[PDB]
Amino acid sequence: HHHMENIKVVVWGLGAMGSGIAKMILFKKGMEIVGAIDTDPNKRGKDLNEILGTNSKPVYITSEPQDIIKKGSADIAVIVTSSYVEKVFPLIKLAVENGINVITTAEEMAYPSAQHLELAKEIDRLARENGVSVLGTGINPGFVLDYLIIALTGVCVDVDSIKAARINDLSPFGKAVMEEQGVGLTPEEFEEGVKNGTVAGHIGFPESISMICDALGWKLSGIEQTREPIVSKTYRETPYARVEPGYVAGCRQIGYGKVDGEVKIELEHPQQILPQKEGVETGDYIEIKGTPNIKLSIKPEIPGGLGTIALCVNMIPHVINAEPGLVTMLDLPVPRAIMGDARDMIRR
């Protein structure tokens, strides 16, 4: 109890999520930053406080992970870089080999066995052999279209099917996001955009669907997805995009989880600029068909960015406290805000 050291965090990746996570860790009593890593030459060497506009014991961003990812130097690394297991696995490996807990936002890491069984097995072996835990989380995947749905099923005698949607407004975002979701394209330019990879859709549905089925004990016979344009019937314009009727207002990603060849789970993530233009309200919508039926909604949707920053930080005690190994949102206690001293949440 006496002279508990602050939870020591390395933020690894300092883009949008890295920055927000760092700001929050500072603001939280019980946690402190001991390292900041990024490959960005613009950021190399700078004091973290300058990047975020804050006053604290200065931390100097390194492009070299290994002068902070050392044995016993930090409690937990927060890896906010790539979407893909194969691109954060080398970072995860380095962190756990030095006995450092890991939280990552990588969508594929929300349930890595869904698409990377052998790599997920290796993360678990490495985390166990080193006595630390690895968690992938986020708002989606990681919370609203998996963990939250799963929790609701806990009040059901029986679940027939699950249909859920998450709807946002792309209008605050810049050109890079517009191009990821095909805003402004023609339907035909959308198809080649998807087929060549400029249209990103949404990453994480195989992870979310697999997590649900494992949780409920369904055995998947297949996972299908579609990534199709949201063809506008109206005029919509923001500083970074202009869609006229017949042009693509955004991208609708759909995930189908199949049991015995039948759809038990359908997840939808339509992303577009200004859905108010055609009466589409933002929000997270969950419907459970079974005994009983359950219809939940959060309007507007839980903020993708703010929520992922908050959830990442809030899960730090749980990943530290968790038994060693790779963990998912199916293994940890309930998420919760840290309105007290984070040191009190550590199991000693």
**3-class DSSP state of 164:** strand
Contact positions with its own copies (CB under 8 A) in 321-340: 329-340
Q: Is 130 annotated as a binding residue?
A: no
In the bound complex, which residue of the shown chain has the CB atom lying closest to ligand NAD?
A: 15
- Which among its own copies, ligand NAD, none contacts residue 82 (Cβ within 5 to 8 A by kind)? ligand NAD
Burial state string for 227-258 with b = 16 or more CB within 10 A and e = fewer than 16: bbbbbbeeebebebbebeeebbbbbbbbbbbb
- Please identify, using beta-carbon distances, which residue of 59 and 329 lies nearer to its own copies: 329
Which residue of 141, 184, 201, 255 would you call a contact of ligand NAD, by CB under 6 A? 141
Contact between residue 227 and residue 251 where contact means Cβ atoms under 8 Å apart: yes
Residue 147 region by backbone torsions, left for phi larger than 0, else alpha for psi between -120 and 50, else beta:
alpha
Q: Smallest Cα–Cα separation from 163: which of 271, 254, 228?
A: 254
Q: Is 154 in the site for its own copies (CB under 8 A)?
A: yes
Contact positions with its own copies (CB under 8 A) in 91-120: none
Which x/- pattern over 35-54 shows residues binding ligand NAD (rule: CB under 6 A)? --xxxx--------------
- Tell me the one-letter amino acid at 88: V
Contact between residue 59 and residue 36 where contact means Cβ atoms under 8 Å apart: yes
**Least gap, CB of 150 to its own copies (angstroms):** 5
- Which among ligand NAD, its own copies, none contacts residue 37 (Cβ within 5 to 8 A by kind)? ligand NAD
DSSP string for residues in 11-44: EE--SHHHHHHHHHHHHSTTEEEEEEE---TTTT
Contact positions with its own copies (CB under 8 A) in 134-153: 139, 143, 147-148, 150-151, 153
**3-class DSSP state of 70:** coil
**How far separated are the first and last CA of the chain, in Å rounded?**
8
Which residue of 4, 5, 15, 296 would you call a contact of ligand NAD, by CB under 6 A? 15
**3-class DSSP state of 64:** coil
Cα 303-308-312 angle, rounded to 5 deg: 150
- Please identify, using beta-carbon distances, which residue of 231 and 294 lies nearer to its own copies: 294
Contact positions with ligand NAD (CB under 6 A) in 81-120: 81-83, 105-107
Q: Is 110 annotated as a binding residue?
A: no
Pairing verdict, β 325-327 and 236-238: unpaired
Rounded CA separation 257/12 (Å): 33
- Please identify, using beta-carbon distances, which residue of 81 and 98 lies nearer to ligand NAD: 81
Q: Is 139 in the site for ligand NAD (CB under 6 A)?
A: yes
Q: Is 294 in the site for its own copies (CB under 8 A)?
A: yes
Give me the residues that bind its own copies (CB under 8 A), please: 24, 27, 139, 143, 147-148, 150-151, 153-159, 215-219, 290-292, 294-300, 302-303, 306-307, 309-311, 313-315, 329-341, 344-345
Give me the residues that bind ligand NAD (CB under 6 A), please: 13-18, 37-40, 80-83, 105-107, 138-142, 304, 308
Which amino acids are annotated as binding site for NAD(+), given as ranges?
Answer: 16-17, 38, 43, 81, 83, 105, 107, 140
